């Protein structure tokens, strides 16, 4: 599914995560080689506030913002970690992450994270 590169970066996507920080580089390694590709035209959430958590995302390509209601509460840099929160903590989204162009994430989905936590 990917190149050197590609694992690289996505790579690099998880390890600067605060609270993705205690895993091990196996276990990473693992999380790299089973993300899978998904893209979203402009307009569509990759994210619902409110949601039970199903995956976690890289941003790839394209532009994403934050948002709590009508309220923007950040723009997410490429390249960078999000969905994580309802995932490692059993809860439900803490805000809605809109597509601001169209976009390609690399995702992950829940039980295959538990999964790899579970080698
Ligand atoms: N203030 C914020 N700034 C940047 N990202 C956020 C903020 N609040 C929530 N997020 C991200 O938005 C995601 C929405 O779903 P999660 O709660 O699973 O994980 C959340 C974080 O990755
Ligand atoms: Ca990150
Ligand atoms: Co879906
Ligand atoms: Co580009
Ligand atoms: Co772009």
Redesign the pocket.
Known sequence: RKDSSEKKLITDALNKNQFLKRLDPQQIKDMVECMYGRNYQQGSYI?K?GEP?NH?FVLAEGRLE?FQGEKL??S?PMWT???????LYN???????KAITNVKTWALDREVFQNIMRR
């Open positions: 994210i506030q958590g976690i934050v509460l950040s997410i970690t999000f969905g994580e929160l309802a995932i809860c439900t989204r803490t805000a809605s992450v």
